[PDB]
Amino acid sequence: ANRFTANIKGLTQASRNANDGISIAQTTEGALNEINNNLQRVRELAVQS
Amino acid sequence: QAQAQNSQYALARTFATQKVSLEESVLSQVTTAIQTAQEKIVYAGNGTLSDDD
Structure with missing residues (x-):
């Protein structure tokens, strides 16, 4: 029973870690979207030039 | 004599x-403490922690 308890607590905190990862990843994704949009507009300008 | 032994x-x-x-x-209680220290270790594994946190 005590071993079961140990594993349960560890697994729960690990799930929280996974959520930490999803958070950081999504922030990076958000920033990269704007990078992409700017690059698209830059290609448009280069076309005009 | 037997009673005395008993x-x-x-x-x-x-x-x-x-x-x-x-x-x-x-x-x-030692089991408890080991387990909590374990949980906070697993949080040390969090790959988003800043040095001050």
Whole structure:
């Protein structure tokens, strides 16, 4: 029973870690979207030039 | 004579139980403490932590 308890607590905190990862990843994704949009507009300008 | 032997072992069992229970208590709490330290270690594995946190 005590071993079961140990594993349960560890697994729960690990799930929280996974959520930490999803958070950081999504922030990076958000920033990269704007990078992409700017690059698209830059290609448009280069076309005009 | 036989009765005397039996009585002495009654006393011995009394004191053995004393010590045994007293150990079990803190042992359970030791399990608790190990487990909490474990959980906060697993959080040290969090790959988003800043050095001050």
